[PDB]
């Protein structure tokens, strides 16, 4: 009975169905809909999901509940409520909020809990749905999809400051001081034509007090979509999200997010003549839920976000900044850390399809783990970002490794040689056409803060553009003093640069430093330099050909890597957890070995450097952090020195002249 006008929603029936779903939801239903019944758990599936969630909601005191719409699809009784939620966002969401409040108070009452209901009934609860279907992009959203839930994923380019939004006006009567407060309804404020008092009636007595109105947060976020599907010849499109209330200041530039919300359309005023609106409507998206964390990529580094989380907890933003690791998951992580072949296993788990790039994969793993992020009481900090250069013959799968790293890391930008530019990295001033105002925007390096910046075709870059990398690769900061901005910016990005030797192929006649052909101050900053070499080895060629041809045995086959690998979800979880909860400290024996090794290297070929000393420090710290050890030992330093020696192919180079012995350097 009593469906609302313009909708298919009946309040009573929808509330009944939502309460039914809340009472009797078990995760085994989602497992059935996922066709994952072989993974059905006896413990978690038995327990009632949302009832428990509402419980911990009551004790913790939060006011926002995050609902997975596919769970609604799982429950037979609420399959129709799913479509009702997609087609009618605002009504159904309000229905859900009222039902959540009702269920909270009912659950308190039924158990006769000592907890008072004063707070509960006064509080306002919000439901934030997500996982609402597919993406479909933005080129494919017809005007009939106005005011529907849509799912968008992309990169957050720019985030505007906080814009106050009026909620209650505060008109004041000049004559009799009749200060009436007018709430805004559907974005409209109605002025009292005269004084609302009967005794006093003066139309000119009204003069709105701007300062005493009550406002609300509003932030506009510029999101550039990265849709799963792209039509032919479609350049990337930018859409304007509009967050509200607690979600403000949650999404930072360079975050790769997946956002769900209401696809809206609003008339735009043709400012040529006031109060005249264009017939083409601007489209934007109201935001209801933001999912930054994903199990296919590493979680955001807590060290770089240590400063804001404590205040954000007070701010009540309540977004999933970090993924929660279960006790079983922690035990599994510790068990894997106890394995004897941990290092080789994690090496081959990254880029599983890449065959027989062992040292390269190990160095990439160490960079992903990173070094210890030291802090000085006096001031300053030494960051454990490892910068890796790849140089060698073409078709050695350098670009594939670059793409793998670019996929795994939480934040990263993949640039390629001539495409990049000095102002393009660092920062630039741009004119946001929407506000027609010069707005400050960040570049690829600052976007890749806290992650791995992948640079391909490094050699092709002009040395002019390369200059900005000098400060970034060492101080982990960029100090820009261009027109209008004079400041320093933090860019904690570990560079992963791939290049070719001069002549696009290695020349054994030339020395190593001539083949690489980079200024010494640059090459000094790189912690690891890889001479990936393509040499005609019959056994190696046969193995590689077999691997590829076997990759061409199905339409979407599985890796031909014979050895087992960690699935990328658990690998990302492991690497992240080791990043947050491990902070190695060097021991004295490691210090002595480091000093001895540094003297040994520091005794034409590539020269030793103090940066190489700090590089061994960082690499040993990273190797220890992989093993979950809280301290650095001698074997870690030995492994780091082995990696540095092997990456530059030091075991096959003549000391006086840097000619690589081609017969000697051969490896399967």
């Amino acid at each position: 009975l009593r469906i609302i006008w313009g909708t298919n929603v009946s309040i009573q029936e929808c509330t009944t169905n939502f309460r039914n779903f809340l009472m009797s939801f078990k995760y085994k239903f989602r497992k059935i809909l996922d066709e994952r019944e072989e993974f059905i758990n006896n413990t978690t599936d038995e327990e009632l999901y949302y009832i428990k969630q509402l419980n911990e909601m009551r004790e913790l005191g939060t006011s926002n509940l995050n609902l997975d719409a596919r769970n609604l699809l799982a429950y037979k009784q609420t399959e129709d409520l799913y479509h009702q939620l997609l087609n009618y966002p605002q009504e159904v969401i309000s229905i859900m909020d009222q039902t959540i409040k009702d269920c909270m108070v009912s659950l308190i009452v039924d158990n006769n809990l000592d907890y008072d209901l004063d707070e509960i009934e006064t509080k306002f609860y919000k439901v934030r749905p997500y996982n609402v279907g597919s993406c479909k992009g933005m080129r494919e959203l017809n005007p009939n999809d106005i005011d529907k839930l849509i799912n968008l994923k992309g990169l957050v380019l720019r985030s505007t400051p906080v814009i106050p939004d009026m909620k209650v006006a505060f008109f004041k009567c000049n004559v009799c001081d009749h200060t009436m407060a007018v709430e805004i309804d559907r974005g409209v404020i109605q002025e009292p034509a005269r004084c609302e008092r009967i005794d006093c009636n003066e139309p000119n007595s009204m003069s709105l007090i701007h300062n005493r109105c009550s406002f609300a947060d509003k932030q506009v976020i510029k999101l550039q979509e990265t849709p799963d599907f792209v039509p032919d010849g479609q350049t990337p499109h930018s859409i304007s999200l509009c967050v509200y209330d607690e979600l403000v200041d949650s999404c930072r530039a360079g975050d790769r997010i997946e956002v769900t919300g209401t696809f809206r359309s609003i008339p735009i005023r043709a400012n040529s003549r006031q109060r005249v609106l264009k017939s083409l409507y601007k489209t934007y998206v109201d935001v209801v839920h933001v999912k930054k964390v994903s199990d296919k990529r590493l979680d955001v580094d807590t060290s770089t976000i240590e400063q804001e989380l404590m205040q954000n907890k007070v701010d009540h933003n309540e977004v999933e900044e970090v993924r929660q690791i279960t006790d079983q998951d922690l035990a599994k992580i510790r068990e894997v850390a106890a394995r004897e072949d941990l290092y080789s296993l994690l090496a081959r788990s990254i880029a599983p399809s890449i065959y027989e790039l062992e040292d390269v994969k190990k160095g990439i793993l160490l960079q992903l783990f990173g070094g210890t992020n030291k802090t000085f009481t006096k001031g300053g900090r030494y960051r454990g970002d490892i910068n890796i250069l790849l140089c060698g013959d073409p078709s050695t799968s350098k670009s594939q490794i670059l793409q793998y790293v670019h996929k795994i890391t939480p934040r990263g930008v993949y640039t390629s040689g001539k495409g990049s530019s000095a102002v393009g990295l660092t920062a630039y001033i741009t004119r946001d056409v929407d506000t027609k105002q010069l707005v400050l925007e960040s570049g690829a390096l600052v976007l890749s803060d806290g992650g791995v910046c992948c640079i391909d075709e490094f050699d092709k870059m002009s040395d002019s553009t390369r200059s900005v990398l000098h400060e970034v690769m060492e101080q982990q900061t960029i100090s820009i003093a261009k027109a209008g901005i004079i400041t320093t910016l933090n860019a904690r990005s570990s560079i992963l640069a791939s290049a070719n030797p001069i002549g696009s192929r290695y020349n054994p006649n030339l020395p190593v430093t001539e083949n690489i052909d980079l200024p010494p101050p640059l090459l000094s900053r790189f912690d690891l330099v890889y001479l990936v070499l393509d040499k005609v080895d019959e056994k190696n060629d046969r193995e590689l050909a077999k691997h590829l041809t076997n990759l061409y045995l199905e339409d979407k086959p599985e890796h031909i890597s014979q050895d087992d690998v960690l699935p990328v979800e658990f690998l990302t979880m492991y690497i992240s957890y080791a990043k947050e909860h491990i902070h190695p400290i060097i021991t004295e024996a490691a210090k002595t070995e480091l000093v001895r090794a540094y003297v040994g290297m520091r005794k034409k070929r590539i020269t030793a450097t103090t940066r190489q000393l700090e590089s061994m420090i960082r690499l040993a710290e990273a190797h220890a952090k992989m093993k979950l050890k809280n301290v650095v030992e001698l074997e870690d330093v030995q492994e780091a020195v082995r990696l540095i020696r092997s990456a530059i192919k030091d075991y096959a180079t003549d000391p006086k002249t840097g000619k690589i012995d081609m017969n000697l350097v051969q490896t399967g």
Binding site: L1, R2, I3, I4, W5, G6, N8, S10, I11, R19, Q90, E91, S94, D97, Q98, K101, D102, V105, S106, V109, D110, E121, T122, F124
Partner: peptide
Amino acid sequence: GNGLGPTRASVMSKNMKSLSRLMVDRKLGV
């Protein structure tokens, strides 16, 4: 019918008040 009913909250949200005005008969469609 049964004689028992779920416990319900007292305060109705303003959005509920707005929705309750737009109410029409259910015979329109299903």
